[PDB]
Amino acid sequence: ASYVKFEVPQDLADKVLEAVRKAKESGKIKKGTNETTKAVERGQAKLVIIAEDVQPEEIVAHLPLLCDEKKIPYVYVSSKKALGEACGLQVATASAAILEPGEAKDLVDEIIKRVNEIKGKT
Amino acid sequence: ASYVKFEVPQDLADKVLEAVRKAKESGKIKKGTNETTKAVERGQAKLVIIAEDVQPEEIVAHLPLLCDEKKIPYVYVSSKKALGEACGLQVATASAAILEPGEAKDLVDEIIKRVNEIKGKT
Amino acid sequence: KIYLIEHVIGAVAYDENGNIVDYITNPRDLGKITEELLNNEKGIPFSATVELLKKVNPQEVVVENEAEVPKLQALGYRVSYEPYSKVSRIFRESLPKVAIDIKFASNEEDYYNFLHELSLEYTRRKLRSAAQKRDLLAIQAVRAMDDIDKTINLFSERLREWYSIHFPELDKLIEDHEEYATIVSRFGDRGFLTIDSLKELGFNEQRINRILDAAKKSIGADISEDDLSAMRMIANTILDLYNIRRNLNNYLEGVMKEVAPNVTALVGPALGARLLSIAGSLDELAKMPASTIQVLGAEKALFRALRSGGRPPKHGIIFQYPAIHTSPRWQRGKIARALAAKLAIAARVDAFSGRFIGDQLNEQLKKRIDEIKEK
Amino acid sequence: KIYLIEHVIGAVAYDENGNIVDYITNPRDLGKITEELLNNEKGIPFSATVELLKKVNPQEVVVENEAEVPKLQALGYRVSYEPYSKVSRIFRESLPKVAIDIKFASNEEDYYNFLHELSLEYTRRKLRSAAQKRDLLAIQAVRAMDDIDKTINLFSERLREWYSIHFPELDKLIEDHEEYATIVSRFGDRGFLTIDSLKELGFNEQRINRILDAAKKSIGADISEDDLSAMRMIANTILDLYNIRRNLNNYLEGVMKEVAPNVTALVGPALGARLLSIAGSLDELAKMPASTIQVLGAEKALFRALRSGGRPPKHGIIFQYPAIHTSPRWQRGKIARALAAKLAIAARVDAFSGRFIGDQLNEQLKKRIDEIKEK
Amino acid sequence: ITVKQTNMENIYECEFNDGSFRLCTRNLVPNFNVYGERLIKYEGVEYREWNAFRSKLAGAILKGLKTNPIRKGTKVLYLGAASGTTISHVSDIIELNGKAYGVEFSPRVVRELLLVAQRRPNIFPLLADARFPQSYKSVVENVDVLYVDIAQPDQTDIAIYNAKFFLKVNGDMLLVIKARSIDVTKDPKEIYKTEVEKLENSNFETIQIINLDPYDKDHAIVLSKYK
Amino acid sequence: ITVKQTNMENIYECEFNDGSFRLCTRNLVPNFNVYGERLIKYEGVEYREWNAFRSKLAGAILKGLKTNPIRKGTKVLYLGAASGTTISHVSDIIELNGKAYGVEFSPRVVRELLLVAQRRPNIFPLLADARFPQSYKSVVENVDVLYVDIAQPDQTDIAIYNAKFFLKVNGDMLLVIKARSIDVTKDPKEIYKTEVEKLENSNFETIQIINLDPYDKDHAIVLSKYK
RNA sequence: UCUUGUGAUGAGAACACUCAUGGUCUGAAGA
RNA sequence: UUGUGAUGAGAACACUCAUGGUCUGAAGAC
RNA sequence: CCAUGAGUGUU
RNA sequence: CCAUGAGUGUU
Numbered sequence A, B: 001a002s003y004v005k006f007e008v009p010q011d012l013a014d015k016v017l018e019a020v021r022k023a024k025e026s027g028k029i030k031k032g033t034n035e036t037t038k039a040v041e042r043g044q045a046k047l048v049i050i051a052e053d054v055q056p057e058e059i060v061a062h063l064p065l066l067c068d069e070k071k072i073p074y075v076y077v078s079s080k081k082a083l084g085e086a087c088g089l090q091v092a093t094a095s096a097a098i099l100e101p102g103e104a105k106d107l108v109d110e111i112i113k114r115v116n117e118i119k120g121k122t
Numbered sequence C, D: 001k002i003y004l005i006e007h008v009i010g011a012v013a014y015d016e017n018g019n020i021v022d023y024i025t026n027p028r029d030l031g032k033i034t035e036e037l038l039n040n041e042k043g044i045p046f047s048a049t050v051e052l053l054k055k056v057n058p059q060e061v062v063v064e065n066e067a068e069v070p071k072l073q074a075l076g077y078r079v080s081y082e083p084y085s086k087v088s089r090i091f092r093e094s095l096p097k098v099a100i101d102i103k104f105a106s107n108e109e110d111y112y113n114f115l116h117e118l119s120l121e122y123t124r125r126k127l128r129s130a131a132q133k134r135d136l137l138a139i140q141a142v143r144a145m146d147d148i149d150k151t152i153n154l155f156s157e158r159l160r161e162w163y164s165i166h167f168p169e170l171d172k173l174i175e176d177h178e179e180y181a182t183i184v185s186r187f188g189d190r191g192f193l194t195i196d197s198l199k200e201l202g203f204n205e206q207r208i209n210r211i212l213d214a215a216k217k218s219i220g221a222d223i224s225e226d227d228l229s230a231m232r233m234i235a236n237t238i239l240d241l242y243n244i245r246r247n248l249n250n251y252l253e254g255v256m257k258e259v260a261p262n263v264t265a266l267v268g269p270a271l272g273a274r275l276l277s278i279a280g281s282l283d284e285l286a287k288m289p290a291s292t293i294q295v296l297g298a299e300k301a302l303f304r305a306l307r308s309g310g311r312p313p314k315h316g317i318i319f320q321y322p323a324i325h326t327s328p329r330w331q332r333g334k335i336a337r338a339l340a341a342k343l344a345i346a347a348r349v350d351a352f353s354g355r356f357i358g359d360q361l362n363e364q365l366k367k368r369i370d371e372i373k374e375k
Numbered sequence E, F: 001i002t003v004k005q006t007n008m009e010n011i012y013e014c015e016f017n018d019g020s021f022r023l024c025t026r027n028l029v030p031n032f033n034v035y036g037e038r039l040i041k042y043e044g045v046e047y048r049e050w051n052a053f054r055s056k057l058a059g060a061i062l063k064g065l066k067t068n069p070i071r072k073g074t075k076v077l078y079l080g081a082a083s084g085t086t087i088s089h090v091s092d093i094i095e096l097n098g099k100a101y102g103v104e105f106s107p108r109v110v111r112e113l114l115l116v117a118q119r120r121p122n123i124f125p126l127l128a129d130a131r132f133p134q135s136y137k138s139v140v141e142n143v144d145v146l147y148v149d150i151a152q153p154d155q156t157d158i159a160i161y162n163a164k165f166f167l168k169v170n171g172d173m174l175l176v177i178k179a180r181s182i183d184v185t186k187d188p189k190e191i192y193k194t195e196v197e198k199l200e201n202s203n204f205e206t207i208q209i210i211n212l213d214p215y216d217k218d219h220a221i222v223l224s225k226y227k
Numbered sequence G: 001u002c003u004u005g006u007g008a009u010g011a012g013a014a015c016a017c018u019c020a021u022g023g024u025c026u027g028a029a030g031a
Numbered sequence H: 001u002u003g004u005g006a007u008g009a010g011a012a013c014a015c016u017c018a019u020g021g022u023c024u025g026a027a028g029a030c
Numbered sequence I, J: 001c002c003a004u005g006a007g008u009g010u011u
């Protein structure tokens, strides 16, 4: 898909979903493309999660640029229902972000550092 | 002159000029056509004095209208130099007003009561 | 002693206790009662009052209106007046009825129907008199003329931003809005700018060379004829509006010399209308102290001053007088105080006589300005 | 491992300690250095850099810019990137000098002289591209169109107050400004009003009767031709401006369908243009959350709220969407929230692809409005 | 919908289709409205919705005016009739047997008051300055109520001068105190206080004082009896 | 009139015809002005009047700026060059040996910055986003002073990123803190405090903090050294 | 059961203007 | 020189552009 | 600028 | 609506 900047292996994609789940409980998260967007623009997000199965694609096409301006890391997952239901919703969610990791700190830190590598960063 | 509505006997004009003097010391007065005007529009004046020898005539032509709207009684005297020097100035003053009579209250009450007569009021 | 009452109903004579000594009913005719009421404003007694004052032949009469007395003295009678007299109060106490007694109307039904249709005619008549005042025409024109000033500036600011998509450099090269609009209007695309056509519009050469050189090296966008036509729409409108403005000015100076020449003499036609405009009328202007004229048009600054005890404005719309906005600020307060002062006089002579003294007024002013400027 | 640097100067290869392993000087040419910088934005490596990567045959290279990484991988090398590397800092610390050493310029004098004339051209070049963006034409045009609206209202309001001196009753009889203006423009004096001439303008009989009857019984002032022509100047301008406005509307719709069809599909050309105008560009609009789009143009209310913890505006310029300002108030918040939502989507697809989904986006929207109105 | 009489003659309330309650009056000239107001039929009678934000009198009622000296057949002198908003409702209340004499000096607005008065035999527009009651002396009668709503810094004194001309003894005066037109500097509460003092020194007996907020900012209204 | 050097390089004062004092700089391109400022000749030398209400930098000086890192031959990175008002004065100060790299992302205004930079070989205009220093990386060098005047909510974070690219260690940063462009809700004093702290946690050493009131409302300027 | 993070709910604050009426500096000293 | 107004007054009005500050967040309807 | 009354524009 | 920067009109 076209707003998908790099390739996430599904072990990583799942490492994410758990960091999200740990963050709902012990920390703070935002769910939905509009709240995600405000979270990046306000420089609050530590990780922005974008789903790969969104249509029309453009609904999230802007999140990678916004994340590049604010130097906030972003990751992909396969299913918008996976992520939606990960976030504690019973509907799908096209994007979301972790604002405060809480008890997922170590988990989120390993994620931004593995996506940094597949992105090619030293 | 044309803004001069009625005829003032100089016995009265003199009664006035003294009523002005008694008010400077013990009460409050305003001197000068502009301060006189503002005193009328503000309803401060208890008596408005206009000199009869003003030139150009129009400079005080409005005070009768102003005095009739706000129902403040007005009187004339012969000299603006009489009045000016009456007022405590060493120049002429084309008009002036008594806001607080002081020890001229009684002197002023008879003035408003004699000009009412030559004006024809019962 | 006889108390006289003048009313729509007719003229009634009263004794001091309140009994009708005699009466003369007015004709039940709208047209005629209107004219008598209008004239009674000027002091003129009803013609019904003169008839009654012959029938009764009274030693001392007393009227309601102080503007009537000299008119009736000149008719031979000894007269005074009493405001809100008991009798006049008494008369009006009985006014649904006494319309019937002195046989002006048969019943309440058409006393009140007549009175109603009188009032509509009386005030329709006054309303027409007000519309006929020359300074109203002055006031509306200067207001329209300012709307045009505002609008010209508004479209010019827009056009420059718009046209600068195609030719950004032209903006800082042509300072004059009427000029900029002309260039956009006649040429459009900057590639159509030549020495000759630019010279035929009276641009001097050192400038003509600067435009063309800028246009040649310009970093602007290529743009369709359709795009330029939208712009040139605004450009021609700015030009149209400039001609209307010049026209209105002529109309304005004309009316303004008729209605208030002394004021035009001091500040010019437009600033004069403007002062009229803010005052409401020449007569409202004529009643003002100089300390008010000096701050007309500066109410925002002024009421922030009077509210907080801060510093009041030195000049209102009067600031527009070249001698004030051109001089250094420490002179302005004084020049304004001088202007206000002369203006107040000028308006009174315009309102109360029509005698012309604008020349001695202008001259006295230019004296006082000179004294100030020598400091 | 070799750390690679890309600069105006050329391409330099570094070892990890900060010594020049090798270099390839850039041509001292404005045209080419500009083109390569513009391309390096897209990630395209310098042709001076591709040459350097052949001289050395390095196992590990690291570039400064991450958009370069994929381009050089396809060229055969193993690549990563390191931002603000110690190496890149070292390079630039030595940059007054290494311009001379690798023989790009003879001295400091014309390294900086060249670099200056490069920066002027580089940014001249970017300046020209930005100006070339189609949405700018849309934005200026709707801004001009709004100014014309503003002005039509101002002159119409002025004209009615002015013409009402001559003919006051006409004001409340002709509700429409373009109408009121035609009558003042075409007739002028109220005595010229005829059944026929009024019928030629599409006025129905019962209206024509009310006008003529009003005009005859009118309590207005008689007024000269000079006075009326002054008025009619303004009256004719209002008419001229209505036409200019209609033309601009047509122009707008044209541009707008090109540049943002999905947005036009939802809210029309003018309202879409207005939103662009407040956003600044289609690209800024496309990055906005719906919760912002919903309140664009209602900043006065919005920030008095965010400042005071008060109630935020339900809708900004979006209020102009008929379904919102026509509906009862309790519906508006919900309809606005829906409008904004679809607009946010519509804006992004116009911005990132140009693909059309405006038809379904509209249809989805009209469903959601129906559900609301059924409550 | 439902209309019901209130504690004051010819003034009614509406229950509405949704639950809003608005004052209204019995329309003296059916199928016509003077400003924009809603026309509503109930038990075949046509009422005019009476907006309290627009008319100070209707404003006062909702802010608890105990008693309304303006009722059926009252003869009332109205200083400051303007466009004709409030006076058209006192027209509906006093009802043909009553008379409303409307004094107003601004031509631009009497221009429209005219239109209200043609349709209502009830109302007598007088293009005149309330500072010179002598100018309309010769058309009006004495009256039961003196309603005064004028913006003039000397409004209260104007009201008084007009009273001793036209106000029946033991009649009522409704005086609107427009604080910001008397003095924008001073506090509106000071103004209310000093002006009622003017009334009492002119032997008006202060009956009630209402503050019109939020219908009208910096306004208070006085009901009193002339002695 | 008199012009005299100050405690800071190439910055002068004027005694004036009336007794008013204004900062000014030694004009690098005689007989030309960038905004509207007065051109003044004294001892056959041309100085440019430096308005303290227009330039944040001159504002800071008169409000007691301790040490001025911008002097002769200084190499400076300028974020937010705008029309070129302030940057033209730092141009006059650093004087041909020095370089001023002016980064500004607004085409409407770079348009006028262009005009200033042509006249001055001292100035290198960069139409670029200060959020992506990678975009002008390939044109500039590293610099002594990093002057930052950008209206952005994340300006301080933007400033830091630009420093670790181009600020020579032990170099200086002038940072203008625009409280109302960071958050109009919050109090400016709080904003100043939270931002200087962002700086100290990225090991900038706070040297001085000036409040630009009344030259610029709700603004402060921070001087610091990068480590 | 239906709509709903591709946005429910709330939101008593969409923006731009016109006229009418009133509130409209100081007060004796200066070179 | 000046009450036919000295002195004071660091507040004449009307606009344009650029940059930033730009709601809520899971429940509602039968 | 404030208050009141009547209104207009995008509609 | 607020802050900053550059400007315009009556002039």
Ligand SMILES: Nc1ncnc2c1ncn2[C@@H]1O[C@H](CSCC[C@H](N)C(=O)O)[C@@H](O)[C@H]1O
Pocket: E054, E055, E056, E079, E080, E081, E082, E083, E084, E085, E086, E087, E103, E104, E105, E106, E109, E128, E129, E130, E131, E149, E150, E151, E152, G021, I005
């Ligand atoms: N001296 C005076 N004589 C007559 N009317 C006056 C007056 N001074 C002010 N007014 C009028 O007082 C009015 C105030 S607006 C009053 C609104 C009106 N009573 C209503 O509720 O419908 C203005 O229209 C003004 O013309």
Ligand SMILES: Nc1ncnc2c1ncn2[C@@H]1O[C@H](CSCC[C@H](N)C(=O)O)[C@@H](O)[C@H]1O
Pocket: F054, F055, F056, F079, F080, F081, F082, F083, F084, F085, F086, F087, F103, F104, F105, F106, F109, F128, F129, F130, F131, F149, F150, F151, F152, H019, J004, J005
């Ligand atoms: N992200 C960014 N990149 C480059 N410039 C930016 C920017 N964000 C804001 N700006 C610029 O910051 C400027 C703020 S005004 C600063 C003006 C200048 N320093 C002077 O004193 O004269 C604006 O011109 C704006 O274009």
